[PDB]
């Protein structure tokens, strides 16, 4: 089984410098690219950027760039994220993330906490150019048993083979459930599905079970930085 496994929780303070890993397993590091994603406590998942082990060619968000350094060691299969000066507003779960643009995000770490002593970016995107993925609603109250519909809008047309769905379930790392906005990916219920191409996509859910109660998020990788929308929570109806 592939996996990514990331070092422990990390408490500093700002200017420190920080280092944290994230090691492959299970398959041939040099072949997939390892991206850098954030989660700021209440906020969306950020792509911060992405590094080819096989030489160790690296882009970085242009939020991130010159903030961060991205790194590989691929004799031992691990990537790494590195903070020269902390700033108090990078405490966030850091999550590593596999891929070869075929299949989106497939593999994901389980999460780093970093906590710095001492709010989230615009949902409707900044003035950096980047593509804003707007997922509607941001919250869908339904029943257990019902079909969830939700929706992710594109602010310019992305090819669909680089659209991509994640489950984060409460208090875990995301997941990839479809890719190439029609794909399920290995082992995801078919309860799920995807469908759509230029700009608008939904995601569908058969039927609402007990464990797909959790937040969804989209994502493009078609241009860079890569996004993702700010997320769907869905829960329970009260009753």
């Known amino acids: 089984e592939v996996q990514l496994v990331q070092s422990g929780a990390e408490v500093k303070k700002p200017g420190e410098s920080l280092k944290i890993s994230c090691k492959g397993s299970?398959?041939?590091?040099?072949?997939?690219?390892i991206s850098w994603v954030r989660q700021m406590p209440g906020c969306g998942l950020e792509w911060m950027g992405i590094?080819?082990?096989?030489?160790?060619?690296?882009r970085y968000s242009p939020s991130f760039q010159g903030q961060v350094t991205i790194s590989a060691d691929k004799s031992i299969s691990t990537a790494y994220l590195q903070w020269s000066s902390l700033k108090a507003s990078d405490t966030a779960m850091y999550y590593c993330?596999?891929?070869?643009?075929?299949?989106?995000?497939?593999?994901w770490g389980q999460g780093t906490l970093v906590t710095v002593s001492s709010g989230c970016p615009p949902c409707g995107g900044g003035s950096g150019g980047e593509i804003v993925l707007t997922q509607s609603p941001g919250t869908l109250s339904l029943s257990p048993g019902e079909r969830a519909t939700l929706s992710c809008r594109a602010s310019?047309?992305?090819?669909?083979?680089?659209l991509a769905w994640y489950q984060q379930k409460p208090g875990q790392a995301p997941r990839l459930l479809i890719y190439?906005?029609?794909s399920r990916a290995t082992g995801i219920p078919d309860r799920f599905s995807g469908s759509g191409s230029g700009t608008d996509f939904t995601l569908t859910i058969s039927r609402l079970e007990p464990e797909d109660f959790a937040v969804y998020y989209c994502?493009?990788?078609?241009?860079?930085?890569?996004?993702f929308g700010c997320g769907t929570k869905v829960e329970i109806k009260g009753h």
């Open positions: 590094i080819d082990p096989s030489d160790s060619d690296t």
């Open positions: 993330a596999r891929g070869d643009g075929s299949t989106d995000l497939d593999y």
């Open positions: 994502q493009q990788d078609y241009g860079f930085p890569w996004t």
């Open positions: 299970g398959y041939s590091f040099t072949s997939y690219w």
């Open positions: 190439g906005a029609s």
């Open positions: 310019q047309s992305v090819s669909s083979s680089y």
